[PDB]
Amino acid sequence: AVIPHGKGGRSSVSGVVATVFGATGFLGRYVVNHLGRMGSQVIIPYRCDVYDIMHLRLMGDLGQLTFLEWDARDKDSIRKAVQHSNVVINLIGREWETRNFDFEDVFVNIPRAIAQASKEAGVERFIHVSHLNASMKSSSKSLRSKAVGEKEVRSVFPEAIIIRPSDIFGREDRFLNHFANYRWFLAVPLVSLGFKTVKQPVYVADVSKGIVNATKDPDAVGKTFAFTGPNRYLLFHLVKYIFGMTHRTFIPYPLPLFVYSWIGKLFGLSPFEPWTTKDKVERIHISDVMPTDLPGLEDLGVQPTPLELKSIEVLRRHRTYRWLSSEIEETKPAKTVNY
Amino acid sequence: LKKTTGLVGLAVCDTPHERLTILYTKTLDILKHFPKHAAYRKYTEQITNEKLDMVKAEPDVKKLEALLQGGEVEEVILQAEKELSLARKMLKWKPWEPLVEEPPANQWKWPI
Amino acid sequence: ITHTGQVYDEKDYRRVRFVDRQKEVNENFAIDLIAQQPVNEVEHRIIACDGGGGALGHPKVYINLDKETKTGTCGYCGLQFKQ
Amino acid sequence: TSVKPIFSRDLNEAKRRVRELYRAWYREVPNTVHLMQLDITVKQGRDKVREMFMKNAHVTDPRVVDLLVIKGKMELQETIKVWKQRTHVMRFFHETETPRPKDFLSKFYMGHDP
Amino acid sequence: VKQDMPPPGGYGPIDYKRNLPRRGLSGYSMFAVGIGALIFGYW
Amino acid sequence: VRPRSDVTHKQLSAFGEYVAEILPKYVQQVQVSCLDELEICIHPDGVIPTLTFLRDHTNAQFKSLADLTAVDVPTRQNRFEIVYNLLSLRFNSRIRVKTYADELTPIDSIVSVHIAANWYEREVWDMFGVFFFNHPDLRRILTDYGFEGHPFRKDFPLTGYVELRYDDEVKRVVAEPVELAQEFRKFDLNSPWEAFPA
Amino acid sequence: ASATRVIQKLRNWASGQDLQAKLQLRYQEIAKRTQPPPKLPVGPSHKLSNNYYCTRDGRREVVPPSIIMSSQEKKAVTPAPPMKRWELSKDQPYL
Amino acid sequence: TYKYVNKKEQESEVDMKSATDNAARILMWTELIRGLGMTLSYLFREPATINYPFEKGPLSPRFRGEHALRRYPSGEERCIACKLCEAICPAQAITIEAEPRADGSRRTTRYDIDMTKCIYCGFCQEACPVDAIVEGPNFEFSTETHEELLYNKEKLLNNGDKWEAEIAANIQADYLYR
Amino acid sequence: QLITVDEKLDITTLTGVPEEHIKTRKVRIFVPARNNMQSGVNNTKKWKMEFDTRERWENPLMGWASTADPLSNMVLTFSAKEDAIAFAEKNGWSYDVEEKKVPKPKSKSYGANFSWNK
Amino acid sequence: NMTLNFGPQHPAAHGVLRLVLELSGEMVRKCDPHIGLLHRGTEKLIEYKTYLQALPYFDRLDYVSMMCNEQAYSIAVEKLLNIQPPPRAQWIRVLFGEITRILNHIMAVTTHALDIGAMTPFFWMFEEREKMFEFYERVSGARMHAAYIRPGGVHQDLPLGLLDDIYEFSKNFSLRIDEVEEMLTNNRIWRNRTVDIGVVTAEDALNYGFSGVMLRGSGIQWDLRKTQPYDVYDQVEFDVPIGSRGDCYDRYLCRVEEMRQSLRIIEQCLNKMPPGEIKVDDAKVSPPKRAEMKTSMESLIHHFKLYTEGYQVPPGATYTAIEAPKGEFGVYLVSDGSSRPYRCKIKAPGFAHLAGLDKMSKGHMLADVVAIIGTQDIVFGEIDR
Numbered sequence A: 001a002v003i004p005h006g007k008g009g010r011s012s013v014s015g016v017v018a019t020v021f022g023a024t025g026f027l028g029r030y031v032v033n034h035l036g037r038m039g040s041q042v043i044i045p046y047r048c049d050v051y052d053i054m055h056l057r058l059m060g061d062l063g064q065l066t067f068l069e070w071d072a073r074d075k076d077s078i079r080k081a082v083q084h085s086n087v088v089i090n091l092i093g094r095e096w097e098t099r100n101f102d103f104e105d106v107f108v109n110i111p112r113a114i115a116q117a118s119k120e121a122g123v124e125r126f127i128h129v130s131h132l133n134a135s136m137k138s139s140s141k142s143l144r145s146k147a148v149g150e151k152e153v154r155s156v157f158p159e160a161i162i163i164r165p166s167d168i169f170g171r172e173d174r175f176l177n178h179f180a181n182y183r184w185f186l187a188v189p190l191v192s193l194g195f196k197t198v199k200q201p202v203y204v205a206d207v208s209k210g211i212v213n214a215t216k217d218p219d220a221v222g223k224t225f226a227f228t229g230p231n232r233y234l235l236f237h238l239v240k241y242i243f244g245m246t247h248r249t250f251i252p253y254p255l256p257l258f259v260y261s262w263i264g265k266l267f268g269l270s271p272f273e274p275w276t277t278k279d280k281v282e283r284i285h286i287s288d289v290m291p292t293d294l295p296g297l298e299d300l301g302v303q304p305t306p307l308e309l310k311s312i313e314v315l316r317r318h319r320t321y322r323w324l325s326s327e328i329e330e331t332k333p334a335k336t337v338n339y
Numbered sequence B: 001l002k003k004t005t006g007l008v009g010l011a012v013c014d015t016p017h018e019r020l021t022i023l024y025t026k027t028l029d030i031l032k033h034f035p036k037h038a039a040y041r042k043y044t045e046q047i048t049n050e051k052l053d054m055v056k057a058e059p060d061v062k063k064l065e066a067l068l069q070g071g072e073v074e075e076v077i078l079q080a081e082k083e084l085s086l087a088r089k090m091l092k093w094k095p096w097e098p099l100v101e102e103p104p105a106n107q108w109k110w111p112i
Numbered sequence C: 001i002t003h004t005g006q007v008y009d010e011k012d013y014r015r016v017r018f019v020d021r022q023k024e025v026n027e028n029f030a031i032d033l034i035a036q037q038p039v040n041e042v043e044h045r046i047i048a049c050d051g052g053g054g055a056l057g058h059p060k061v062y063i064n065l066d067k068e069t070k071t072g073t074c075g076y077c078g079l080q081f082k083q
Numbered sequence D: 001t002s003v004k005p006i007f008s009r010d011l012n013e014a015k016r017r018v019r020e021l022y023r024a025w026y027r028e029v030p031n032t033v034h035l036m037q038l039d040i041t042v043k044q045g046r047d048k049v050r051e052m053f054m055k056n057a058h059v060t061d062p063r064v065v066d067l068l069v070i071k072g073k074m075e076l077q078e079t080i081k082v083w084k085q086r087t088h089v090m091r092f093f094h095e096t097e098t099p100r101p102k103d104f105l106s107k108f109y110m111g112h113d114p
Numbered sequence E: 001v002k003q004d005m006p007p008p009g010g011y012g013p014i015d016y017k018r019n020l021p022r023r024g025l026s027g028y029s030m031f032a033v034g035i036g037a038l039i040f041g042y043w
Numbered sequence F: 001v002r003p004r005s006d007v008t009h010k011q012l013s014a015f016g017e018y019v020a021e022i023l024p025k026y027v028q029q030v031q032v033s034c035l036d037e038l039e040i041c042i043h044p045d046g047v048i049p050t051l052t053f054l055r056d057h058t059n060a061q062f063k064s065l066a067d068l069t070a071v072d073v074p075t076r077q078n079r080f081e082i083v084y085n086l087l088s089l090r091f092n093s094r095i096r097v098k099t100y101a102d103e104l105t106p107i108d109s110i111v112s113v114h115i116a117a118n119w120y121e122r123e124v125w126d127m128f129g130v131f132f133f134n135h136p137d138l139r140r141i142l143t144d145y146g147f148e149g150h151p152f153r154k155d156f157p158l159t160g161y162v163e164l165r166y167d168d169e170v171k172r173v174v175a176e177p178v179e180l181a182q183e184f185r186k187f188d189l190n191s192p193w194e195a196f197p198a
Numbered sequence G: 001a002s003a004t005r006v007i008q009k010l011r012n013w014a015s016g017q018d019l020q021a022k023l024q025l026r027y028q029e030i031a032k033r034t035q036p037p038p039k040l041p042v043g044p045s046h047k048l049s050n051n052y053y054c055t056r057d058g059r060r061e062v063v064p065p066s067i068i069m070s071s072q073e074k075k076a077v078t079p080a081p082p083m084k085r086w087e088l089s090k091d092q093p094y095l
Numbered sequence H: 001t002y003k004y005v006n007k008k009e010q011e012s013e014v015d016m017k018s019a020t021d022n023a024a025r026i027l028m029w030t031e032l033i034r035g036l037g038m039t040l041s042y043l044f045r046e047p048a049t050i051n052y053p054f055e056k057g058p059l060s061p062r063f064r065g066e067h068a069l070r071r072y073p074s075g076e077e078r079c080i081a082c083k084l085c086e087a088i089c090p091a092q093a094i095t096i097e098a099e100p101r102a103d104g105s106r107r108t109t110r111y112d113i114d115m116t117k118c119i120y121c122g123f124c125q126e127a128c129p130v131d132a133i134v135e136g137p138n139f140e141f142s143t144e145t146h147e148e149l150l151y152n153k154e155k156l157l158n159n160g161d162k163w164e165a166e167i168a169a170n171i172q173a174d175y176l177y178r
Numbered sequence I: 001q002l003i004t005v006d007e008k009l010d011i012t013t014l015t016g017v018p019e020e021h022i023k024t025r026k027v028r029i030f031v032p033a034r035n036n037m038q039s040g041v042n043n044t045k046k047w048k049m050e051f052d053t054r055e056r057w058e059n060p061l062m063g064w065a066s067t068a069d070p071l072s073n074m075v076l077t078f079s080a081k082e083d084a085i086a087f088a089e090k091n092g093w094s095y096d097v098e099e100k101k102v103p104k105p106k107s108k109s110y111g112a113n114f115s116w117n118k
Numbered sequence J: 001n002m003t004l005n006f007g008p009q010h011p012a013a014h015g016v017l018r019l020v021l022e023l024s025g026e027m028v029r030k031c032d033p034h035i036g037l038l039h040r041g042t043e044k045l046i047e048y049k050t051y052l053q054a055l056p057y058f059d060r061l062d063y064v065s066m067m068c069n070e071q072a073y074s075i076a077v078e079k080l081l082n083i084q085p086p087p088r089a090q091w092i093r094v095l096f097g098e099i100t101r102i103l104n105h106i107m108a109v110t111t112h113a114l115d116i117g118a119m120t121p122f123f124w125m126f127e128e129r130e131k132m133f134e135f136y137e138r139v140s141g142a143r144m145h146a147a148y149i150r151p152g153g154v155h156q157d158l159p160l161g162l163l164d165d166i167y168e169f170s171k172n173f174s175l176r177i178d179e180v181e182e183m184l185t186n187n188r189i190w191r192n193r194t195v196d197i198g199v200v201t202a203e204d205a206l207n208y209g210f211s212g213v214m215l216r217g218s219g220i221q222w223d224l225r226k227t228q229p230y231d232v233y234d235q236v237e238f239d240v241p242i243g244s245r246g247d248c249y250d251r252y253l254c255r256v257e258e259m260r261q262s263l264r265i266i267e268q269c270l271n272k273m274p275p276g277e278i279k280v281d282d283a284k285v286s287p288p289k290r291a292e293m294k295t296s297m298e299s300l301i302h303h304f305k306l307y308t309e310g311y312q313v314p315p316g317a318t319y320t321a322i323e324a325p326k327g328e329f330g331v332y333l334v335s336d337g338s339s340r341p342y343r344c345k346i347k348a349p350g351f352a353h354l355a356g357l358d359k360m361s362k363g364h365m366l367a368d369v370v371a372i373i374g375t376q377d378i379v380f381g382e383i384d385r
Ligand SMILES: NC(=O)C1=CN([C@@H]2O[C@H](COP(=O)(O)OP(=O)(O)OC[C@H]3O[C@@H](n4cnc5c(N)ncnc54)[C@H](OP(=O)(O)O)[C@@H]3O)[C@@H](O)[C@H]2O)C=CC1
Pocket: A021, A022, A023, A024, A025, A026, A027, A028, A046, A047, A048, A072, A090, A091, A092, A093, A094, A095, A101, A105, A106, A129, A130, A131, A132, A164, A165, A166, A167, A168, A173, A174, A175
């Protein structure tokens, strides 16, 4: 262990040495931020070239962030990453099944091997992240596969926390940017005209802070928390609201999903990071599940942050010079649906 | 007579002896109100009287420039009216008075 | 390992620093290298070790080699001299 | 005692000036949140103004108050004549820093010297 | 004894003043050249 | 041992008396250092009057302001010691007029007497906190736009209380209380033995 | 250097100056490295006699500033003799 | 002694010849052509640049460059931890903590020069009595990561061993001067 | 004309110090003693007020001492006890003055050492 | 008025300058320069550092005239210690002081042209500048930021080949000034860009505290090198290049002349440098020689105390001004009896000059302001300190 000395800011010590395999991610970026702010020792396994992880260097202090070369297929790389970590956090995930990695791999196969080694190593706790409402029978292969994982990893690593976040709201997120980027599309398809798929977003930071707090709290063991949010929404208001802040016309036109799953298939064929995914589409119209579960935010210590509050920052880049100065007050809020 | 003074902004003043005699006599006048034994009155009256006397005595400006220093004659004109302005200012200021206030004790002790 | 037995414990995490990198240490250790040099058998009670090279060496000091049992050692070089 | 007055002869006259500055800031908060594209709420900001104007509510001496507004006025000038960019303004909100608990038990659990 | 010093008798002399050379063709002569070109060119 | 000419220590000394006599309402002390430098000391109220006499007097023209500074002797009731160093291109001599100002007892501004002071007076306010009445535009010059505290005060920590880093979460530079990774080692250097009577 | 004469002539002309005489690039004119060893001179105060420091320590024989006009007929006196006018140069008065 | 630059001694009254010469100067840009000649001239001069990797700009023995800790020929590190190299460092760069080695000798357990803090003044070179810390000739030690720039005793001792031959030659050349 | 204020000059509001370090910092006004190592007394002359010592945790990467307290290395020197007390009151720091303790006069005479009966 | 800031990254802004300009059309009606972008705390750090360990700071205030800057601190500290440098050292400081004014002027004239748009003058002279740094490096070991001029005397004797090499540089340097002389002194384009721009009247220059080439350019005759001769400037002969009218041209012409006059002073210094010691022989002020500290106890004690504790200069205060290439550089050093200073106010020729930009750049275009900053030779290290 490492006795925590310091005042609490950078150049201080908190005693959490933590491997974080998928740090380069949108959620990840945030996880390393708090861990680094707190003063924790963060080992970031990376596969993308050094150029892309530079954004993580200034976070954390000198000799507090260590970057290791790692390959998912190669078991040895995971082995050495967790050699000297006592906390392992797994954020490995993707939306597009890539040529050399299947949803199973990114969600269930890999995240197993990882926790498996972590145990061999003797890491005190492992945090595994799987998408919210993930039935072993859910339509989207992604969600189901993720469900498959949360089970397995429990056998490789017992009492391994399993936070299960909803789609995340944050700058650089998809949930909010995706819809806002429908601008290019003249019309914005919305299955069931964006109805009956009530959704509860959660700010990225809230998720991050929550995750971090898990690392430094004994109360969470085998817990399957669910960071959800401060307000639910029918996809209709969300879509329009977005377009509202973006100040771009909103033209909700219903599109039969059966045909739309096909549109997802189309972009899905794209070689360079398909923008929409068959598995995405389903997910988007996959209704958010209700909140009866080990609570996440608040329960883990952070009060959720309403979407409207920070939406202005996430959607600003999509506006035009004409609306750049416009502020949240000028715009209207969307409506929640306790349903 | 000269084409121009070294200093960029200053401009050649024709009738320089007359301009100086005007300014010098004025100052002497203003000083006449200062308290009788006022230090500024006695000191400046002495300086101004010597300056005039020389200006009255010398009819050649080049030698005049040597006698009361001043570099170019134009500068001496600026210095004299600058002094005339301060003489007016000090009459209002009344600096001939005693010290306004003694320094707080140990105010001027440097080794500290 | 290092000159002073600086060896991170089997559980310390600064060992992560050495992961995928060389922990810089020097094979040539002084404690040993001075030992090799033999005791200088001077024939005067007090001798001086200027440090070798005069100005290019260490401050000059005189050592008392009177103690028959032990040998004088320059607080600077570590060189030893015996009478 | 026996002090010389800086600009305000008494707390009364001084308070007049504070009123003016408050108004100034109150009228300005909205503009800044728009010219700096700050991600804050005008109402929220206006409360902050109140916070600061009261953080120094205890001052009883007239001279201290007068300097306080001089300084306050200077800050406004840096924010209405914009020389202070967002990073500067948002700092007022202490947005990134983690709040420290003041509960004894809390401190005991975390810091050697509270 | 041996310290870095000016050579005996001092060093030689160094030039500091501007040595810009007023080298050019005289103006009248110059005009003629261009004028001549035009005069001939026109013919 | 430096060569010292007493011609100056006599000339300057005399001038000191001359200034004092001419401006007795404000001159408190007038000394010449062993380094042949005069240092008329004036009551803070004499800032305007003493300078003006030196800027515009035939027998003492002190046209340019070399510098305006404020040492801070915390022990001294009047903390700051505003020092104005002036030069006389006519008489090739410099004089220093130094006054005393406490934190909340402002000094007059001399921007009128010398416009050179427009900037230095802003510099003294930013670093030490002395205030100058009638200043055209007094506002921080050297410190950051949002800086809180006057830095050159002897009671201000060197490292200060705030430092800046870029935070990704907020994608903007953000102050945090200073956390230093090797504190300034405060070597004690004074020797317990004095040197001379001085 | 090492320039064909013609290039040099073009150079000298286009520049209007004998640039060859004063080339910027340095060639075998610069002080050779490893100049001889230096035995520097020891200054005064190294005498072994009549060298008492008390007789050569201006550091603290200095005294506290002399004070005039402390708060605790006569002719006018200037800060110093009025300055003497500088004289135009004689090698190159103008330009 | 003063000198007027840009002061026209007198008013040369225009003479046709003078006027023509001037008018020609404005009309046919004569002085502008003068300037072009100067640059054409250098175009023909040999360029002064050096192939940087192949050729190196000359540095004489006192060049401060990169810190190194020397050792006695026998093999005993020179430093005896008097710690005044720490005292005179202007930037607070050198951190030294010491304890009596088993041999009984004085030696530094930790000697850390923070090169990013160091401003390469060369006073440490000056201050050391045994001259254990020296300003080594190498200036090329640019590093990908900030941590590499912080140097402990082992890096400096290793730096000392690598460059000892040249450091000894450099100190040999300049010690009479010091 | 001057105005009257009985309020102890407190200027805590102008100094620009973070709230935490004005209400949790105790400073001690003391005349420094003499390290017994040396017999010189020139460092036991002026009073000094020193802020309370705070955390000095070891740094993980290099082992250097690290401090989060800004007012640590600051020791202000004041010539007299009265002036130092004043600085604490107007700056709002708590103070606990320690009286100067000067060596008491001691009677010495070389003759005693050769006393018939000591 | 279309407020526009000359932001730091822009090359003409010397790296750090945020001139809030009010553009009344292209004509600029007001400038409010926002310096402070390079305030490092140089004068609050010096209070915590001994007199020798604060010397280095003075090489970084104006970073283009290093040694002349460290000749102002060295003269100050020396005054407060009533000690004088040995004769050879004073000539070496005058030799290095004029190499620095040639170095600053090559900096000021060529970078001004870089701003106006002439690019070649910078390259020709900058090669002549590395020739010069070499002289710093060969005498101190640092190309710039030497630390050679010490509070008492200078640090080490000149290497045995430097004065020959300084002669060879000075011998051929004047042609190099002559060459940019032809390329940028009569070009109608330069004259038009520089002549009649930023005229400053004589009394206004004294009132604004300009004190530099800006003072001399308008015809006021003031050089601290002849008026108040510091070091040996009483035994070297030179002509101050007083300009007549004050336009940015007359100021350029003055800067080109001072480079020429400095070659005249450098010549005299090489011709007449005395045999002797380079640092005063008081071990109390200047550190003992390497051989002496390693063979004599009094010298080791003096080396140990000087490096660890300090000179302990006697209590007092002094304002010492030397003619730095930019203008009058002065240090007001207040000293308690302690080895570390109490206050060190660096008067920067530049804090006064930048204040003058608003008055000097009056009725002028956006382009004129680029020339106005260029003709003040402002380095923000000195202004920001
Ligand atoms: N809206 C959301 O973001 C939600 C996310 N989640 C879960 O949170 C986790 C983090 O999400 P997010 O950050 O958006 O995901 P990202 O798409 O940002 O990727 C996360 C990280 O996983 C790494 N990664 C992906 N595939 C592989 C592979 N085959 N081998 C090695 N590394 C890989 C990536 O590294 P690289 O880019 O270098 O390949 C990346 O740094 C995910 O696992 C997801 O299941 C759950 C609910 C909502």
